[PDB]
């Protein structure tokens, strides 16, 4: 008898641009996003991992 | 559609170029292309999800 067994291996790789998601094409918001410094690098590091 | 608003001079359209637009008091930033979309007779702008 032959029995099938299914197992997942990987999922989709995704990445987000932080500046474009928070303040899309806005210069006044992009200068105010630098005040929350080192908050998007710590996030893109996790997604790349 | 708008009825009363203040004294700002109008400027010619610049298409396919990263500009700062101002349509009836809607400040933004993006590139402008001709559209095939369909509006209502009274509608002024369209939104997304």
From Swiss-Prot, chain B:
Domain of life: Viruses
Role according to the record: Attaches the virion to the cell membrane by interacting with host receptor, initiating the infection. Binding to human ACE2 and CLEC4M/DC-SIGNR receptors and internalization of the virus into the endosomes of the host cell induces conformational changes in the S glycoprotein. Proteolysis by cathepsin CTSL may unmask the fusion peptide of S2 and activate membrane fusion within endosomes.
Name of the protein in question: Spike protein S1
Gene encoding the protein: S
């Amino acid at each position: 008898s032959i029995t099938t067994e299914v197992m997942p291996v990987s999922m989709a790789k995704t990445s987000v641009d932080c500046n474009m998601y928070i303040c899309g094409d806005s210069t006044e918001c992009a200068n105010l996003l630098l005040q929350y410094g080192s908050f998007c690098t710590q996030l893109n590091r996790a997604l790349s991992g | 559609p708008a009825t009363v608003c203040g004294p700002k001079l109008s400027t010619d359209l610049i298409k396919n170029q990263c500009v700062n637009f101002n349509f009836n008091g809607l400040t933004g930033t993006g590139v402008l292309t001709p559209s095939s979309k369909r509006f209502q007779p009274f509608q002024q702008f369209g939104r997304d999800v």
